[PDB]
C-alpha cells in the first residue's frame, strides 16, 4: 500500500475504501478477536458444534524437530495451564508467549486472548505524519 508494513505492501494496491463481498477477503485481519460476548463465549469466534474434535495446531502430526510458536488456532486446554510450558503466538511484532496461564482460557482458541489491535502504539514505527494523525483520531496525545 502506502507504508509497506510487509513485503506485500510492496505488491498490493489499496483501492480506497473498497467495498467487499460479505466474507471474502484476501487478508484475514481478524480485528475482532478479543471480543467478550458474555452468553456467547463458547460460540463467538469459536468452533460451531460443541462436540467437535480439536484443530490441528493441537497434535504433532509427524516426527518434528520442533516448532518456534503455536497458532491461535490451537485451543487452550488443561495442558496449557498446568503444563506451564511455552506456547507462542505470532502476534505483532514478533511473538507473544502465554506465560501467565489461567483456567478461564480453557476451551477457546487463543484468538480471544491475543489482542489483534493494540491500545498502546509505538511511535517508534509511526511516521512523523502518522503520529499527528493518531493525535487527530484520538490515540496519542499532543
Amino acid at each position: 500500500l502506502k507504508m509497506a508494513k510487509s513485503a506485500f505492501g510492496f505488491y498490493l494496491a489499496r483501492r480506497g475504501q473498497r467495498k467487499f463481498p460479505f466474507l471474502r477477503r484476501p487478508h484475514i485481519k481478524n480485528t475482532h478477536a478479543m471480543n467478550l460476548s458474555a452468553p456467547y463465549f463458547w460460540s463467538f469466534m469459536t468452533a460451531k458444534s460443541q462436540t467437535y474434535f480439536l484443530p490441528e495446531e493441537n497434535y504433532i502430526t509427524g516426527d518434528w524437530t520442533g516448532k518456534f510458536f503455536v497458532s491461535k488456532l490451537q485451543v487452550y486446554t488443561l495442558q496449557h495451564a498446568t503444563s506451564g510450558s511455552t506456547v507462542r503466538v505470532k502476534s505483532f511484532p514478533s511473538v507473544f508467549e502465554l506465560s501467565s496461564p489461567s483456567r478461564w482460557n480453557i476451551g477457546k482458541e487463543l484468538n480471544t486472548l491475543t489482542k489483534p489491535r493494540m491500545d498502546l502504539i509505538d511511535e517508534q514505527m509511526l511516521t512523523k505524519k502518522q503520529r499527528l494523525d493518531y493525535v487527530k483520531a484520538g490515540l496519542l496525545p499532543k
Binding site: 489461567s102 478461564w104 498502546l120 484520538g138 490515540l139 496519542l140 496525545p141
Partner: protein, 50 residues
C-alpha cells in the same frame, strides 16, 4: 487467576476522548433543530410529524 492488585501497562494507556457532540462527525451539538414541534399553535403541531 488471582487478579493482580496492580496494573502494569495496559491500564495506563492514553484515554481515547469520548465523542463530544452527536450526529455527523459526532460534532452536532445539543441545541434545538428545525424538527422541533409546537404544542401551542393548532390542534396539529407545526411542523407536524407524519
Amino acid at each position: 487467576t488471582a487478579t493482580p492488585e496492580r496494573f502494569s501497562i495496559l491500564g495506563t494507556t492514553h484515554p481515547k476522548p469520548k465523542r463530544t457532540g452527536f450526529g455527523r462527525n459526532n460534532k452536532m451539538r445539543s441545541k434545538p433543530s428545525d424538527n422541533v414541534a409546537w404544542y401551542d399553535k393548532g390542534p396539529v403541531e407545526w411542523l407536524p410529524r407524519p
